[PDB]
Design a protein around this ligand. Sequence first.
Ligand SMILES: [Ca+2]
Length: 223
Amino acid sequence: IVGGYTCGANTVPYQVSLNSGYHFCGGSLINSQWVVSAAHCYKSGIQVRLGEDNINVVEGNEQFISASKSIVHPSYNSNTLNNDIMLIKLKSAASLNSRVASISLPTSCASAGTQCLISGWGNTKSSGTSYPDVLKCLKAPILSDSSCKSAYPGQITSNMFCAGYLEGGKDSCQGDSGGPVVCSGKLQGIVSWGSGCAQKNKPGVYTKVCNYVSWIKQTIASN
Ligand SMILES: [Ca+2]
C-alpha cells in the first residue's frame, strides 16, 4: 500500500497473509474454513496465516493453517486477468473472536463514490521498493466505470472496477494482491492489478466480488 497508514494490530480481523516460506499475497477470511484471494496468487503448498500484524514477529494472536484445496475460478484468464478470483479451503477451521473474524459477502454491488478500506503488506513506494513488516491501510473511493475505462482503454471487463485517486500518490501495490476491498462492512473487491503503483491516471483495478457470490456459495456448499 502506497500513501496509506498503519492499520493497528488486528483492526482488520479478516485479513490473511498467504505464506509459502515468505508472504506473497493477501486474502480474506469468509468463514471459519474458507479464504478468498486472487487467482493470480495461485501456488501449491500454501499456508494461511491469520491474526497477523507484524508478519516477521510472533505476537500471540496468530493462527497458521495449511490449505487442503485451492479452486481457481473456472474462467480465469491469466493474460487479461478476467475472473481473477480463487478460493482456498483450510485443513481445519479457524477459531473466530474479535481479532480473527470473517467478512460478509455482499448482497448488492457497491456504487461509484462509495468509500472502501484496502489493506495489505505490499510495497509502500511508487518508485523503488520497501516492504513493511506491519499491516498498512488505505481509504479509497470506487471510481466510475467511465473513468476506469478511460484510464485503461480496452482492458476493463464487467468483472473489474477501479478504486483510488486519479491524481496518484495513494494505491495498493505488489504484495497487496489477493487482499480485501471492504465497503460498508462487506467484501466488494480483491486486489488484482494496476500499471505500476500510485501513478497519475492509473488507479488500482479490483475484482468485482458481487458478480461471484453464487459461484462462491455453491462451491463452499459442495467442497
Ligand atoms: Ca506475527
